[PDB]
Design a binder for this molecule. Structure first.
Ligand SMILES: [Fe+3]
Ligand SMILES: [Fe+3]
Ligand SMILES: [Fe+3]
Ligand SMILES: [Fe+3]
Ligand SMILES: [Fe+3]
Ligand SMILES: [Fe+3]
Ligand SMILES: [Fe+3]
Ligand SMILES: [Fe+3]
Ligand SMILES: [Fe+3]
Ligand SMILES: [Fe+3]
Ligand SMILES: [Fe+3]
Ligand SMILES: [Fe+3]
Ligand SMILES: [Fe+3]
Ligand SMILES: [Fe+3]
Lengths: 169, 169, 169, 169, 169, 169
């Protein structure tokens, strides 16, 4: 049993390992989305920058979980991170919709992870999830929903172009 | 169902809406208290400033709840904010006592709101309440209790005058 | 009779108290409008910021009246501030239209309040209303009319999006 | 019943008082460890500085609990803080091992304290423990485990000397 | 016999160890006093700050003795530091009176410790006590006496409140 | 055929896509290595930092390839990035050895990729590989070889500890 290990159950440890993979998968999806919008026939640099930052955030999410795994004395077990479910992400609206779905799936997995720590009485892990993940997920999800609304509002073509310039830096 | 909505129950949404009204009511009470102490026959500017700041805090509390309501995909439903239960707030000690009672009622409503999010497994909402409201309520309640003790200590007249100058900026 | 009281009639005092409530109601409406545009399915942050500032202005209007009430030796009597007449404010154009109607109703109430001070020979109150309220109302009303014209000009969709970005900070 | 007291159970109050003593005991242990490594026949100044800082941290932990006790309207009841269980702490590795054991015992007591606040529905206290104690305990425990690993890695003699210089400031 | 040991008698070493405990006990008393005045039904923040600083001073006194013990080649032997003789410290005047009594008891113990070093011809220890403890004790005792006089002068209630603000930062 | 596409053969495009995956795999390996050395029973922070930076470099390598893919009008096709071939990386020497092997495999794949661009007369791609990848690979490989030599030189235990401190920041 590892030296730091205390109130840290195997199922909590395993859940963090699955969440790590999921965070890495999200990072991969955003990375795919970013360079999708960098395609010359897409060429939306706001979306490219936005998803690249999103990708880096998910990388941070994964690594913070790996860091946390080690903090608690769990052992990081990495899995294949699957290629994202699409190669092309449609319009800015489609990608933002796909991002919302992605973030909601990550959020659900985080809430499921919280339930694991909750049922195991892992008080520290629960607060770690709450403070470091659940809040950001809620912010991200609201933010992406806002983007989806605006991408619907502005419409295709010039609207999507303007959204790229005005809603994303 | 709204785009961000996830693990966000209707009763949690409704509880936030009641809490919004309660925060607005507290803001209104403090506002009333502030201008009560600005009456020429009261004329305690520390108390005026103190309750004005308290009022602005409660406004922030309400708006942070409205913001949070939207973040989770709830729909803000506003109600009449009732006029405060008094028009005149007695002495500084009386107002501080009334403020304590007010903050404890807000605190209880927040704890009741936490129970709603708790029973609904709303992990994010619980941490939002804890981090953003429960801690401040506990600080505020301790702080007002301290003020009440000192207002009792100093007594009426010059004591209340000195408290106004020395305990409130 | 309060110490400052001089050339300050009961009807002027009562009119200020009604105006306070009206200013608070306007503050509430703008607050509702602000968080309406913060809804994920509205998501117009310029409108959110704009109405939040408008809301804070009306709060200032109310408090300046409460302050003034006390200055003249009147007694602030607070009433329920009613919930705004809508929960949802339609489009940016609709909200701006509703804001115009609101500001014109506040303006009329202010002009009615001026008539009260006028008929009571309350020279100071009249100038207070003129300098501190009537001018701003006229500026606000012109400004909102301009916004309404531009929101009509730009049309729904991308136009409303662009207006949000370009006419509101 | 004290003025701030609200949702603050006697068993939570009593648990904080025991935890205060435990934090003070940990502060005492670290203090003992610090001056142990300041012995001329030990003379490891990194370990001295490290445990002195650790000691001050535990003092802060105790005082933050006393502060919190008062915030909630509990009454601090102090007990004898027992002398640490050793007068001499062996090698740097031994002291670090003893520190790990100490921090894990404090951590368990904190987790037990959380369970008390949890079972009493003390939502604020739980978040206070989580935010202010459980996270730091997890960081500390991981950090001490790392130190123990490195002290094992470097071995006695020069290794312990180098660890003192390179892993502790 | 330890390497630094020279003109350092066992009774001097033992006296330093008792004085360490006494300094720690004083630190504990002041700590108790500090958070006593932080009670919501006491709420004197000057007294809280004052005794917290006093507490930290006694901690420094203890540690300087532990440091000195090691400097001379003595071995620090820690004992239980007893809980302070009261849980509640009465009025500011009572606490200041109790502090005077405490400091005079510490001072007497220091003078007794000086006699031990004196009779053992421990010239360095005597000067260490004189320079580092006896002078501060005399300053502290005079200072606390002054406070007691002023707390008597100002009386209960507002006087104690004013003393808290004006004589203690 | 994409708008930028010119002198950009399908096999060059496909080779970049495989190299992207390989760069991502290397990034994953380094990430695994980094948090391996962050294990409490490994606890080598230089190695953790070193491999984290290495990981970020490989991420940059992958993304620069994705960017380049798009620049030439190729289409990024992502694949599963496989979990690294080990979960635990042994000693610092073992990890550095594994890193060398990894970098040499990436280097060979890059040289194979260069041959593809070479045989296709892709003059720009060749120079892109040379300037942006081959040089860094050669620097990295030399640098890791140096580290391996020094990790062999210093030996296990304190040596590995010292290497962690002195050869890695
Ligand atoms: Fe994530
Ligand atoms: Fe995200
Ligand atoms: Fe929490
Ligand atoms: Fe509030
Ligand atoms: Fe409050
Ligand atoms: Fe107004
Ligand atoms: Fe207005
Ligand atoms: Fe502690
Ligand atoms: Fe600790
Ligand atoms: Fe002392
Ligand atoms: Fe003293
Ligand atoms: Fe002398
Ligand atoms: Fe690479
Ligand atoms: Fe490399």
């Amino acid at each position: 049993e590892s030296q730091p290990r205390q109130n840290f159950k195997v199922e909590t440890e395993a859940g963090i390992n699955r969440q790590i993979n999921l965070e890495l998968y999200a990072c991969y999806c955003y990375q795919s989305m970013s360079f999708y919008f960098d395609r010359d026939d897409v060429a939306l640099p706001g979306f490219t920058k936005y998803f690249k930052e999103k990708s880096d955030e998910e990388r941070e999410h994964a690594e913070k979980f790996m860091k946390y795994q080690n903090k608690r004395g769990g052992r990081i077990v990495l899995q294949d991170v699957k290629k994202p479910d699409r190669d092309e992400w449609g319009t800015g609206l489609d990608a933002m919709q796909a991002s919302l779905s992605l973030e909601k799936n990550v959020n659900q997995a985080l809430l499921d992870l919280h339930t694991v720590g909750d049922k195991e009485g892992d008080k520290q892990f629960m607060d770690f999830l709450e403070s470091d993940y659940l809040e950001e997920q809620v912010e991200d999800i609201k933010k992406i929903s806002d983007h989806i609304t605006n991408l619907k509002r502005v419409g295709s073509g010039l609207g999507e172009y303007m959204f790229d310039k005005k809603s994303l830096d």
